[PDB]
Amino acid sequence: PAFMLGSSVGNFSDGKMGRFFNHTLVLLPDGCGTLLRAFYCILEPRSGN
Amino acid sequence: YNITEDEILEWFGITQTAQGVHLFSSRYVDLYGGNMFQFATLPVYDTIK
Amino acid sequence: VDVGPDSVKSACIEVDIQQTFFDKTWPRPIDVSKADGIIYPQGRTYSNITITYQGLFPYQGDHGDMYVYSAGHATGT
Amino acid sequence: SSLILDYFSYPLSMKSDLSVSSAGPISQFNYKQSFSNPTCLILATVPHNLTTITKPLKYSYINKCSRLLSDDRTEVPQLVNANQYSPCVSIVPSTVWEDGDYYRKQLSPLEGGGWLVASGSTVAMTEQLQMGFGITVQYGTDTNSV
Numbered sequence: 420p421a422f423m424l425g426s427s428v429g430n431f432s433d434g435k436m437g438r439f440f441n442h443t444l445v446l447l448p449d450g451c452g453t454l455l456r457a458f459y460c461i462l463e464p465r466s467g468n
Numbered sequence: 469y470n471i472t473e474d475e476i477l478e479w480f481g482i483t484q485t486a487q488g489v490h491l492f493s494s495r496y497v498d499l500y501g502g503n504m505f506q507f508a509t510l511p512v513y514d515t516i517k
Numbered sequence: 518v519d520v521g522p523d524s525v526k527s528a529c530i531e532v533d534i535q536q537t538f539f540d541k542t543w544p545r546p547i548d549v550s551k552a553d554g555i556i557y558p559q560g561r562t563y564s565n566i567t568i569t570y571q572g573l574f575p576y577q578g579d580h581g582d583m584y585v586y587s588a589g590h591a592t593g594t
Numbered sequence: 595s596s597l598i599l600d601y602f603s604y605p606l607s608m609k610s611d612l613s614v615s616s617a618g619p620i621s622q623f624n625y626k627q628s629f630s631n632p633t634c635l636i637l638a639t640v641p642h643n644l645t646t647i648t649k650p651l652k653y654s655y656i657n658k659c660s661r662l663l664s665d666d667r668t669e670v671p672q673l674v675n676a677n678q679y680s681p682c683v684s685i686v687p688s689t690v691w692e693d694g695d696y697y698r699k700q701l702s703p704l705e706g707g708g709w710l711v712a713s714g715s716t717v718a719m720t721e722q723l724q725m726g727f728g729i730t731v732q733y734g735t736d737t738n739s740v
């Protein structure tokens with residue numbers, strides 16, 4: 420699975436729950452799950468379709 | 469982190485202390501068993517809520 | 518303070534919500550007698566003894582927060 | 595088993611606020627020690643024959659941190675925990691421009707609602723920079739290996 424951890428909760432551009440401000444911890448598997456990448460970094464939304 | 473691909477059930481645990489975020493798993497030690505065992509000590513700066 | 522390149526143009530692919538499909542029951546409560554999901558002592562193991570340990574642990578028989586992943590739509594290839 | 599060590603800018607003026615039982619703003623909203631772990635405090639100064647370190651613009655700390663609820667009548671006090679950070683840190687910048695700076699932000703109803711505010715104070719840069727180190731040890735949290 421993929422994990423998202425933080426300390427701030429807010430709404431998206433459409434008002435739906437899920438936005439996490441500031442630094443956020445992300446756990447994500449890759450390479451068909453062989454790699455287990457983790458990072459507590461800053462995430463920024465995109466404004467596309 | 470590297471985990472070999474297989475078809476064996478496993479376990480994972482996550483917690484936090486003042487040291488940081490501790491990640492526990494059974495893939496490092498107890499492959500055929502299943503128990504928590506220390507593999508990751510993420511140096512987090514803030515408390516996760 | 519790191520690096521990392523963006524993959525493609527800012528045009529995300531479409532995402533749907535079909536959580537009614539994902540709603541199903543596969544109850545797997547944890548059995549502590551079956552030794553599922555117990556945090557080991559962090560640096561001091563033991564052997565062949567029965568010992569009381571105070572720490573962070575789950576309740577016996579919790580339905581939990583079971584989640585399931587699914588594949589996307591596809592027509593042929 | 596492990597050695598944890600925090601460094602910060604700490605001049606001599608609030609040295610008497612370094613006590614655990616002190617009720618000053620440093621122990622109120624800035625930093626609190628571990629009651630259950632052995633601690634050491636070091637207050638040091640930049641040597642003249644040492645150019646490998648720099649100094650901040652000015653010292654700054656937080657004198658007020660509380661939560662305003664959505665009812666506009668109830669204020670919840672905040673307490674700093676052991677090696678933890680107050681939510682007011684998320685709205686207070688690292689360098690405070692001037693004394694009496696007031697910072698405010700909106701709190702979501704999932705996080706209790708209302709607003710979060712804080713107030714800070716600044717101390718002018720003296721001739722030489724003084725800093726503080728906090729040393730805390732852990733004996734059994736990992737393999738005893740330092």
Ligand SMILES: *[C@@H]1O[C@H](CO)[C@@H](O[C@@H]2O[C@H](CO)[C@@H](O[C@@H]3O[C@H](CO[C@H]4O[C@H](CO)[C@@H](O)[C@H](O)[C@@H]4O)[C@@H](O)[C@H](O)[C@@H]3O)[C@H](O)[C@H]2NC(C)=O)[C@H](O)[C@H]1NC(C)=O
Binds near residue numbers: 518519520521522524
């Ligand atoms: C998929 O993974 C590949 C290998 O892990 C990625 O290549 C790496 O991409 C990451 C960013 O995504 C970067 O690795 C970073 O390294 C920096 C410091 O290294 C930089 O400097 C050295 C020389 O000093 C240079 O050789 C590197 O290329 C970096 O420019 C760290 O601060 C980061 O935390 C991170 O580890 C590199 O760009 C690159 N490294 C290597 C060894 O190939 C690949 O980019 C990933 N996929 C995508 C789409 O990004």
Ligand SMILES: *[C@@H]1O[C@H](CO)[C@@H](O[C@@H]2O[C@H](CO)[C@@H](O)[C@H](O)[C@H]2NC(C)=O)[C@H](O)[C@H]1NC(C)=O
Binds near residue numbers: 565
């Ligand atoms: C681990 O502890 C058990 C419990 O005492 C030991 O097993 C006992 O050994 C005696 C010796 O004859 C038997 O009479 C008991 O019936 C055994 N009890 C059980 C539950 O097996 C065992 O020897 C110990 N093992 C080690 C390696 O110390």
Ligand SMILES: *[C@@H]1O[C@H](CO)[C@@H](O)[C@H](O)[C@H]1NC(C)=O
Binds near residue numbers: 440441442683684685
């Ligand atoms: C966290 O994010 C909010 C909103 O983006 C911002 O107002 C605040 O200053 C940020 N705090 C930190 C410490 O980055």
